[PDB]
Design a protein around this ligand. Structure first.
Ligand SMILES: [Ca+2]
Ligand SMILES: [Ca+2]
Ligand SMILES: [Ca+2]
Ligand SMILES: [Ca+2]
Length: 134
């Protein structure tokens, strides 16, 4: 119900979203400076700059720009990781990620995780983990 959401939020029921409407939409999720973050995204998708977008721009906006595999997998990834992490660190490492994932048997995750982290530090955070997908 992606669209149903876009139209839903649009109490007006016209078939278009705005900066405030979208702000509220995402806001419904969290409040990690969605105002600014969004402002950036919006302006990104918004080529003209009417300050308002439509279901189309909204759909493309939901992802990022021009590329989306499975956002649900992303939100679900953070959700899970958030569920597991009961220590309350907010951050994770390649050893911890591989340690937990290893349970599954997919070590490749360590390879993709190691390649993803082209820093050499050997650690990552939730913010970096999310933005990493973006
Ligand atoms: Ca509207
Ligand atoms: Ca627009
Ligand atoms: Ca942790
Ligand atoms: Ca890192």
């Amino acid at each position: 119900m992606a669209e149903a959401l876009f139209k839903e939020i649009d109490v007006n029921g016209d078939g278009a979203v705005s900066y405030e409407e979208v702000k509220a939409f995402v806001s419904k999720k969290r409040a990690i400076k969605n105002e600014q973050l969004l402002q950036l995204i919006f302006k990104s998708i918004d080529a003209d700059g009417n300050g308002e977008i439509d279901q189309n721009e909204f759909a493309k906006f939901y992802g990022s720009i021009q590329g989306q595999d499975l956002s649900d997998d992303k939100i679900g990834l953070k959700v899970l990781y958030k569920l597991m992490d009961v220590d309350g660190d907010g951050k994770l490492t390649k050893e911890e990620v591989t340690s937990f994932f290893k349970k599954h048997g997919i070590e490749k995750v360590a390879e993709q995780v190691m390649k993803a982290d082209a820093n050499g530090d050997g650690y990552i955070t939730l913010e970096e983990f999310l933005e990493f997908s973006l």
